[PDB]
Structure formats: C-alpha cells, structure tokens
Amino acid sequence: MKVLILACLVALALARELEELNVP
Amino acid sequence: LVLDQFGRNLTAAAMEGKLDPVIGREKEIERVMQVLSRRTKNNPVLIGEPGVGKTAVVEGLAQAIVHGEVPETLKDKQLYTLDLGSLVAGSRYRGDFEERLKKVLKEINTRGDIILFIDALHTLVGAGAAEGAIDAASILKPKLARGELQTIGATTLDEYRKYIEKDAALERRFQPVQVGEPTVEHTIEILKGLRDRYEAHHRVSITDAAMVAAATLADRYINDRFLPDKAIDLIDEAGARMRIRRMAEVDDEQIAEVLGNWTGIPVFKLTEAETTRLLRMEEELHKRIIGQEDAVKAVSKAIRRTRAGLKDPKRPSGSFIFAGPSGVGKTELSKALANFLFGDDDALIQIDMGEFHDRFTASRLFGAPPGYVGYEEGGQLTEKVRRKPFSVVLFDAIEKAHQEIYNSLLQVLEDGRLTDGQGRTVDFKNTVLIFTSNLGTSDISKPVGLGFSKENDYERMKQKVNDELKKHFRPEFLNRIDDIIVFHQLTREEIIRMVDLMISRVAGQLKSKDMALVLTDAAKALLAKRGFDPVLGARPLRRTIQREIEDQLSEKILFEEVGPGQVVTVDVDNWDGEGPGEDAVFTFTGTR
Amino acid sequence: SLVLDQFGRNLTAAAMEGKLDPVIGREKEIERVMQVLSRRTKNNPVLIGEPGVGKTAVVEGLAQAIVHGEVPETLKDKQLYTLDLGSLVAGSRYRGDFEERLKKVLKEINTRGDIILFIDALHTLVGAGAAEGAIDAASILKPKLARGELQTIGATTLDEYRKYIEKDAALERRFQPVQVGEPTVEHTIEILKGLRDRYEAHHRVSITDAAMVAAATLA
Ligand SMILES: Nc1ncnc2c1ncn2[C@@H]1O[C@H](COP(=O)(O)OP(=O)(O)OP(=O)(O)O)[C@@H](O)[C@H]1O
Ligand SMILES: Nc1ncnc2c1ncn2[C@@H]1O[C@H](COP(=O)(O)OP(=O)(O)OP(=O)(O)O)[C@@H](O)[C@H]1O
Ligand SMILES: Nc1ncnc2c1ncn2[C@@H]1O[C@H](COP(=O)(O)OP(=O)(O)OP(=O)(O)O)[C@@H](O)[C@H]1O
Ligand SMILES: [Mg+2]
Ligand SMILES: [Mg+2]
Ligand SMILES: [Mg+2]
Secondary structure, three states: OOOOOOOOOEOOOOOOOOOOOEOO | OOOOOOEEEHHHHHHOOOOOOOOOOHHHHHHHHHHOOOOOOOEEEEEOOOOOOHHHHHHHHHHHHHOOOOOOOOOOOEEEEEOHHHHHOOOOOOOHHHHHHHHHHHHHHHHOOEEEEEEOHHHHOOOOOOOOOOOHHHHHHHHHHHOOOOEEEEEOHHHHHHHHHOOHHHHOOEEEEEOOOOOHHHHHHHHHHOHHHHHHHOOOEEOHHHHHHHHHHHHHOOOOOOHHHHHHHHHHHHHHHHHHHOOOEEOHHHHHHHHHHHHOOOOOOOOHHHHHHHHOHHHHHOOOOOOOHHHHHHHHHHHHHHHOOOOOOOOOOEEEEEEOOOOOOHHHHHHHHHHHHHOOHHHOEEEEHHHHOOOOOHHHHHOOOOOEOOOOOOOOOHHHHHHOOOEEEEEEOHHHOOHHHHHHOHHHHHHOOOEOOOOOEOOOOOEEEEEEOOOOOOOOOOOOOOOOOOOOOOOOHHHHHHHHHHOOOOHHHHOOOOEEEEOOOOOHHHHHHHHHHHHHHHHHHHHOOOEEEEEOHHHHHHHHHHOOOOOOOOHHHHHHHHHHHHHHHHHHHHOOOOOOOEEEEEEEEOOOOOOOOOOOEEEEEEOO | OOOOOOOEEEHHHHHHOOOOOOOOOOHHHHHHHHHHHOOOOOOOEEEEEOOOOOHHHHHHHHHHHHHOOOOOOOOOOOEEEEEOHHHHHOOOOEOOHHHHHHHHHHHHHHHHOOEEEEEEOHHHHOOOOOOOOOOOHHHHHHHHHHOOOOOEEEEEEHHHHHHHHOOOHHHHHOOEEEEOOOOOHHHHHHHHHHOHHHHHHHHOOOOOHHHHHHHHHHO
16 A cells, blocks of 8 residues: 655766866 | 868868768768758758768768769868867967867868868867867857858767757757668668778678678667668678688678677577587486476577577567476576576576565666666666677566566567666567566465365466466566466476486585595485475475485584595485385495 | 887787786687777777776787787787877876877877777776867777777776766777676686796795686685
8 A cells, every 4th residue: 555755866966177278 | 281281181082082982871962962052051960870871971972072973062072071189189379279270261261162071060069178268169150150161060869969959059050960870771782882892901702692691680689889880890890700711702601600709699500519409408408407398398499499590580589487386497497598508507697586576676677767876887687688688587586576567578578679777778689588487386285176176286286377477467468478387396206316416516516525426326215205395396305415415424524534535425224215214314434 | 109108008019028918718809809900990899898807818918919920910010009098198288288199199000000009998088188178089089990090909897888988879889899708717727827827936836726726616
C-alpha cells in the first residue's frame, strides 16, 4: 500500500575557475 | 596568400586529387548550392551525426567546382576550410587574433570568389576570445549580417542546438542542412566509389561481395557509429589486415573477421575446429552441467541459430526463462554457456535481480538520467553490453525484481534495443538473455492437489511453474521469450555424476598441494545417497561433500596426517550400499 | 626531432635503450594496432581496456616491435613519440601559445612522416589547453585524425572512454577501439615469466616459478 518517494539527487557544482590567455 | 596560411583550399585539393571521391550525396551538394543562393538563411550548416559525411559534402562540393558541375554563380569558387587552430596559433600579442581574422575576411571580400567553410561551426564560440579580446564568433556574427560572409558550417545535431541554434541572430541566417546517415545501398555505392583509393593504398583488391558485406554487417552489428565510416572502417582495416599478409583480395569473409575483432561479435565464417565444437556443444556443456538435457539443447538451438547467420536480427540471439527447482543448474548452465563462448564464466554478465526489488533500482540497469549523479558511468546492464555486444546476460532471480524493470526489459525482447540513461539505444540483438526464475519452489513437496488421484514432479511441476510464471509476469513479456525451460529435479543417477563434478573441485585444490584425491565407488555412492534430496538437488550434495570430505580433509591436512606428495584415498568403513548409509564413515588414508 | 623531444618521449628510442618492459603476449593487440595504423583514413587506434591490463604496454610492445623489425613495412622505422599533453599545455600563458606548440608538433610530424603518436590518456585531449578563447587540442587534431594524415595511438580506460571520449562523439569516431582485454591467469603467468628478469635485477632477488604462478592465481 505504501509508496516510498525516493529522492533523485541532482548533480550541482560550483562554477568553474578558468585559466586565462595572456595578451601583452 | 592570407587564406592559405589559415585555411585549407579544398578546391585546390580537389584539383590535385587529394580529396576522396564523394559519390552519392549529390542531392545535398547541390542543395548546399541552393542554400548559398538564398535571400536570407543563406548559410548552409551541415548537421548530421558524426560520420555521415558532412565534411565529405563540402569535399564533394569542392570536387563539383573543379569539374565545372556547379552553377556559374559558384563556378571557380575556392572553398577554404578555415580551421580555428591556425587562426589562434601565433597571436602572442594584442588584436593579433582580430586582425588575422580581419585579414581573412578582407581577403574574402577582395577576391570575392571564396566560399568559406567552417568545419565544426560550434567551435566558433570561444576562439581567440583572449583576455580583453573578442572571440571569432563575435567578429563574424556581424559580417554574417552584412551578408559579406557566406559560410558553410558543419556541426552535429547535438552541437547545432547546443550552440548555433540558440544564437537567435544566427537562426535567421544559418540554415541546417540535414546530412542524413546513408542507407546500406547508398553506402555500397560509396564503397564502390572508394575502391580505387583503398585498393591503391593497401595494394589489395576489394571484391563486390566485400563491400556489400561491409555496409550490411556494419549497419547490423554496430549501434555506436554511422553508415559511411562504420563501413569504411571495415573496408580499410580489412585491406590493412590483408596487406600485412602479403608482406591480395579482400572478401566477404575478410570483412567479417575485422568486424569480429572490433565489435567482439563472432560473425566470421566458422573454422573447422569451431564448427564441430558447436556440433558437440551440448556434449561440451555436459562437461560442466549434469543432466538438464532439455535446457542444454535449447541453449544449443540458440547459439547454433546465431552462428548459422539465421536468427531474427530484430531480437536477441537467445532469450530464456530458466525456471524450476532451486539448485538444479539454472545459474550453472548460464555460467557453462558463458564458459563455452568465452573460456571463462566471469564473462557472464550476471545481473542478480534480487537486489532490484526496489522500484527505482532500474537506474542501475540503464543508468541515471543526465544531470543526476552517476549519469556519466551509469548502467551496469547497458554499458557491459555496449562494450561486449555478444554476451550471455544472466538475470538471476528475475521474479525478485520490481515490475517496472520488466517493462524496461520488454523493449529489449521486442526490439533488441534498450534506451539507457543518456538516451542511446544499446544493441541487445547479439545477447543471450537468460532470465533465471525460482518459481515452482516455494511449496515443492511433490505438489499434489486433493486426494484419490492415482510423473508428477516434472510433467506436472512444469505446468505449475508456467502457471506461477504467467501470473507473475506480463503475458507480452513471456511471449517474447524464445524458450521457457522448466528444469528437472536432479535424479539420483545425476547426483552420482554430480559427485564427480564436485570432488573434482576438491581434487583440483589438492593438486595445488601436490596431493591427489581418489574416491572409491563406494565413497561416491555414500556421498550421492546422503547428498540426494529429491526437492533441492546438488546443494545438499555440496554441503555433504563439505561436511564429510572437505571438513575432514581440512583437519587431516592441518594435522599433517596427510600432506604434500601423498595420494589421499577415500574409502568407507562400515555399510555396503545395501544399508541405510548413515552408520558408515569415510576413512582417509594417504599412500605415496 | 627537437620540437617533439620537449613535448614527447620517444618510445622507440626508449625501446632501443632497453628502457621499456618486455610485453609478453598481447601480440593480437599489437597486430591489431598495426592494422589500424596501416589504414588509409582514421588510422588511429585507441587502446581501451580496464586500468592496468596493459594498454600503455601494448604501445611499448609496439615500440619494441618497431626497433626489432617485427613490424610491417608500413610501420617500419617509425619513431613512436608519446605526446605529453601536460608538457604541451605547460607555459602556454599567452594566446595561441598552446595552439602554435601543437601546430609545430604536427608540422614536424608531417615533414618527417615517420612519427606514430601515442597520446596516453586520450580523454585528456578534450579540453587540452582550452583556456578562455583557446581552441583545445582535440579541435586541432580532429581534421588531421579524420583523413589519416596523423597516425595517433590513444589509450584510455573503459570508464574514461565512456565519460570523456564518448561524450565528444566526433572525437571517438576518429579513433578505432582496440579492446585490450584483461589477461587470463595463464597469460599473466607468461607476462610474469617474461618480466621476471626485470624484477630480479631490480630487487637483487630470484623469483621462483611457483611465486609467479601464485602471484597470478592469488591476485
Ligand atoms: N558520400 C560519400 N562518398 C564517399 N565517401 C564518403 C561519403 N560520405 C562520407 N564519406 C567518407 O566517410 C568518412 C567520414 O566522412 P566525414 O569525415 O565527412 O564525416 P563527418 O560527418 O564530417 O565527420 P565528423 O562529424 O567527425 O566531422 C570519410 O572517409 C569520407 O570521405
Ligand atoms: N545440473 C547441474 N549440473 C552440474 N552442477 C550442478 C547442477 N545443478 C547444480 N549444480 C551445482 O550446484 C551449484 C549451485 O546450483 P545452481 O546455482 O546452478 O542452481 P540453480 O537451480 O540455478 O539455483 P537457484 O534455484 O537457487 O536459483 C552449481 O554451481 C553446481 O556446482
Ligand atoms: N603483455 C604484457 N607483458 C608484460 N608486461 C605487461 C603486459 N601488459 C601489461 N604489463 C605490465 O603491467 C603493468 C601495467 O601495465 P600498463 O601501465 O600498460 O597498464 P594500462 O592498461 O596502461 O593502465 P592505465 O590505464 O592505468 O594506464 C606494467 O608493469 C606493464 O609493463
Ligand atoms: Mg567532419
Ligand atoms: Mg541460480
Ligand atoms: Mg597506461
């Protein structure tokens, strides 16, 4: 009779640090 | 000039014969020429799956220009594949990237006979974008407006929407040209047009039988690549395997050898040692499973359909419910079938369905949907068959899974496909699916009805299993199963041979000690009569051999009463087959 | 080379100096990569397999097969360089520095014409040197790899192949999956017997045949 509602964990991460290209 | 130091002139490459012949695909070379002559949306971006010949359409456009088979408005145009890599390279200073791209665009407007081709048009976003610098996408977006820049693009269908589509500005300017995956018959005409390139590189001869086989066997036995290359992969590697042998004819059989090495699916012509091995396969499976002759035959009918090129290629190579009593060789036959086909029973994809009784552990079979954790590695069913398409997949204790899992595996028996978490269909058409059930053993007591009734433990037990089967499974799940096999109880004569199969594991571990294990015929008779249950079979025999042989031998080895270099002869004291067989005890005497 | 010495390790120079371990067996996999490297187009084998089944060893067994002349005339006297992508990224702080290093590498391959490339960890080619506006090494190689004008061996684990190479469906096309299977125990004993002298000389020990039958069986 019962239903278990589980819990779909989503993949959530902080924004990526980037590495820069230099122009002198 | 400016365009040669960045782009590759495809029109000059077509004059020098350096581009492959693009036969077929003509209706879309001329369609690219239609789109280049439009009012707006005059930039054809060739969208299509990777391998269908998007670059080849523009390479076929370059060959059409040099042959004079284009309109006079595209006559003597110079196609340039502007690679972004040569455009970014250098640029160790400021504007270097914007002025190297302005000099490209100034040279396109000055000569006016350049059709720019930007292969991988999705990579235009973020090219030369340096700190305080604008990428190649921001420089051209404008030029597109002025229409001073007819470009041809080539993205995939995924990366067209993922980028080019989004840009609304690009939408009213870029026109997606569907570059379809060709049919098998179109691919054969591609391979015929590409004979003289691959027959000259490998100095082989490629028969018409091989190219028909290359396009047919690649469509059939691949679900991860696309027709043009998937079949050029077979032609080119077979000509490469052939030119290692002459250091000159690539045949139907040479293509299937290459497909056999690459997918792992045996599609090649059976060698004489392997043809007779499939003739004696039931005899070779009986070296590892005792009895169960109706079940060994039915998995023998399935493998021999596949190697006779004769199974329905819209449906798995074998589909089986192994059912019956617990312990009579349902998992043992699945391991023996995997030990036949692969030499090792850990090549069985054994998906033990008893740990899938939750509603949502189906995400272990096909994978998580994208964006939910474990999507990138998801699918213990789908990824093991994506890697090994010819597999024996055991769904052990299938009745202990949730009902929603069967509806997931219902598409499997119908189409041979299974959409995983990402959405890619995994080809199950070359799998032997075995759904082991244990139904008909939860009441097994020589199942009788009411009294006065006057061959009940099979002919009857079988229809009790089939009755418990169809009341548990969907009827459309069971109609898709090729053979539902209800297994026999192991007879007493099969338990006697099952003693030999189980002492041989114990004797093999004494060989690691350089010891032998000889049993008398009375010793094997006593194990068989105390290891016989007519309701379970062979696990009471296993437990008997552990209690009466192995646990006693494990003491004798640790006492060092018997030791290395010594044959343990197992005879019985007391009893002689005619008694009840429980007053007698084994004795262990070492000899040499 | 001199451009490619600072971004690559020559495995055929290492195989002449005895600096590569012997590769016992794996001859159907070395024959397989010699077929893919002998192809006209897409002549690029990726060695897929579980970690430690000998994917890097197959190329090192290929590099030993070149210097002992056990290759065809297609692969004869090829100098196999293992392209260090980490060296190729390193010190590329200005714009286009990474891209011009890879173009100088690819120009040196075309002028010599005897260079097999081994990109170990081929999944790291995606996003290799992809800074702000920095065309990665995958987008530079994908024109070269598709038309067969660059002979490159990749090696990727099966997990890293579905996670990073199959997620760039254009790049996985350019490579042919050569499945490097895990050895059997009998094949592993042969591997240990042929590696026996390397580990005896290093540890100043003697390794009994019992020990290598046990080391493959017990592992
Ligand atoms: N119509 C055709 N005639 C002859 N060869 C073809 C044709 N279509 C494709 N090919 C060949 O198939 C192979 C792959 O084609 P191509 O590289 O153009 O595909 P693509 O879709 O552009 O690939 P990607 O998405 O990886 O860039 C090449 O060898 C190409 O010459
Ligand atoms: N028919 C058989 N031939 C040979 N060995 C057998 C047979 N049946 C059982 N055995 C032995 O018993 C072991 C366990 O039996 P197995 O798991 O194959 O039975 P099962 O009927 O599939 O089990 P269950 O009904 O519990 O799902 C086998 O690995 C093998 O050692
Ligand atoms: N056929 C073989 N003969 C001899 N040694 C081998 C063989 N295959 C693997 N080895 C050895 O096994 C060890 C690990 O092999 P290797 O580093 O090539 O594995 P790999 O599959 O590349 O692993 P990873 O994916 O983690 O890089 C090394 O010592 C290597 O020399
Ligand atoms: Mg292309
Ligand atoms: Mg079982
Ligand atoms: Mg490695």
